[PDB]
Design a protein around this ligand. Structure first.
Ligand SMILES: [Ca+2]
Ligand SMILES: [Ca+2]
Lengths: 331, 331
């Protein structure tokens, strides 16, 4: 149906065609770039880049800020907030900002959306119309998992490190090098890392085990827990688990894995005094009535979004959508 | 009114009279022991001991299990569960187990209670009738903060290390030594530790700043965050903050400090499908109606207990207290 490019953790990548690899660097890297070369096929050119900074002590790097360039508009996503810099006094704003669950969903009219958790990871969804016309770190959308190493010169190179380094934006950035083993570097956290990441092989994800192989995700969890030693390994572990959770949710079946002792969420914080409407939905609501989305309309386009969601009462069931409450009606 | 002996974090102690110090060891240590020596004043003798294990890599130790001895009854508190070993087929069971908020409150008829968070810390409350007749790691209850160093031989010694080592249970245990500086040992976590523990000096605890000095608690938070490097520093930071939170709550005023990004609780997990009764009370309910506590009775003896609490509807407002729901009536 729709392909997905997933970037999460400490340089873990997943191409549109299904190829997976690992690469770490400290520079600006372009994930998806439209209109490769000078060929402009009467379409707008969109460019998304990520900023990586060295997090930890072994040498691993994680994404910190994401910049979006399209139609002369520049958007910045840092510290969990959206800041617009590039402003054009013409045409029409093509991006819409939505807050569904724990993700920061943005939508564009061209057919490209983003799923940002505001911490480390980012999910990219592309329409099938852009097949065979997109190049970048996510690989060419050609449904072939063996030719996803175009090093910006239309030349497939098996060197993953060279392929990653060939996509650097600033020429002055230092060249990336091969990483070490975080578990070997810090052998006093291996037992804790294994005990925490053993939940992937537990009976909770029995349904996911029959569709998605968890070996790669388990190894990623172990590596992240061994490397996330700069303070806040709980967030790294939660993101590593949520990556596989969203991957399994994309298939179509949802599984509840959260636990008050394992990555908890405070859904009651948004509830006002004397009221209770917010609830936790592991599978995410299909469609809800908001100010911009009337009751008669229901856009079932995105699936697999977990987080706190409100349950408006029958009286005043329209979500006001700007100050987190349900209202009778809005203009 | 009532004195309190608090043990939390990595060997942080607070005597009944108000003296505070720090000591780390790896053995069984007696906190409060009744009837010091051979003097039996026609009262039952209670003895509470704690088990410390080396947690981390610098050399700090934290409590893991707590054993209670009274009336020939032995109780064990490990892995967040209560296990009874010492059983006597005579007299009557003098202990009651209650689950209020996040603490595991146990009550005894003699006048001694315990507040266990099931993770690291333990709070002891003693009746004023036991003044000047209790010796142990909590010091003699004599309202004097300068003679709280009785090293089991009725001799006050200024050496905190010697005073702590003189209370070891097993003679074969190794003698404790002076600890090092965790922040100096791991200088790559100082910035993160300071950024996390700066919440104590923020405007949230402005009311607490006028009653309890937060310098000692801030130093304890910094040291714990620098030392808790074995995996799970979030739990260590949460316990360090909750210690000062409970200390301020004991004064009489309550302040809400929890945040969905700072030590969250999943109060919605206990809510059944289609119902919403559980809520988070920073100050704790004064009294609630349960199966063993009718509506006409309200025991207002303990204050300062935060956590998830249920709000039963007017219909069937009696808490069933054994399977987490509200029922109309129970025998
Ligand atoms: Ca390809
Ligand atoms: Ca004393």
């Amino acid at each position: 149906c729709l392909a997905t490019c997933a970037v999460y953790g400490d340089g873990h990548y997943l191409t549109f065609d299904g190829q997976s690899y690992s690469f770490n660097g400290d520079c600006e890297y372009t994930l998806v770039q439209n209109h490769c070369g000078g060929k402009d096929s009467t379409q707008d050119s969109f460019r998304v880049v990520t900023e990586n900074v060295p997090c930890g002590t072994t040498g691993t790097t994680c994404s910190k800020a994401i910049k979006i360039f399209l139609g002369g508009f520049e958007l910045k996503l840092s510290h969990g907030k959206v800041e617009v810099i590039g402003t054009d006094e013409s045409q029409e704003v093509p991006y819409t900002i939505r807050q569904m669950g724990i993700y920061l969903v943005v939508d564009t009219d061209i057919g490209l959306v983003l799923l940002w958790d505001k911490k480390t990871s980012i999910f990219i969804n592309l329409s099938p119309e852009f097949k065979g016309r997109v190049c970048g770190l996510c690989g060419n959308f050609d449904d072939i998992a063996v030719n996803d190493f175009a090093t910006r010169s239309r030349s497939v190179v098996g060197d993953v490190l060279e392929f990653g380094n060939s996509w650097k934006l600033s020429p002055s950035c230092p060249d990336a090098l091969a990483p070490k083993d975080p578990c070997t570097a810090n052998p006093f956290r291996k037992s804790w890392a294994q005990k925490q990441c053993s939940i992937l092989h537990g009976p909770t994800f029995a349904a996911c085990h029959a569709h998605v192989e968890p070996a790669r995700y388990y190894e990623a969890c172990v590596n992240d827990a061994c490397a996330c030693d700069s303070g806040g390994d709980c967030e790294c572990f939660c993101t590593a688990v949520a990556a596989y959770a969203q991957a399994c949710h994309e298939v179509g079946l949802c599984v509840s894995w959260r636990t008050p002792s394992i990555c908890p969420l405070f859904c009651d914080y948004y509830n006002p005094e004397g009221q209770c409407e917010w609830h936790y939905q592991p599978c995410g609501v299909p469609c809800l009535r908001t100010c911009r989305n009337p009751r008669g309309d229901c856009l079932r386009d995105v699936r697999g979004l977990e987080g706190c969601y409100p349950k408006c009462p029958p009286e005043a069931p329209i979500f006001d959508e700007d100050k987190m409450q349900c209202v009778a009606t809005c203009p």
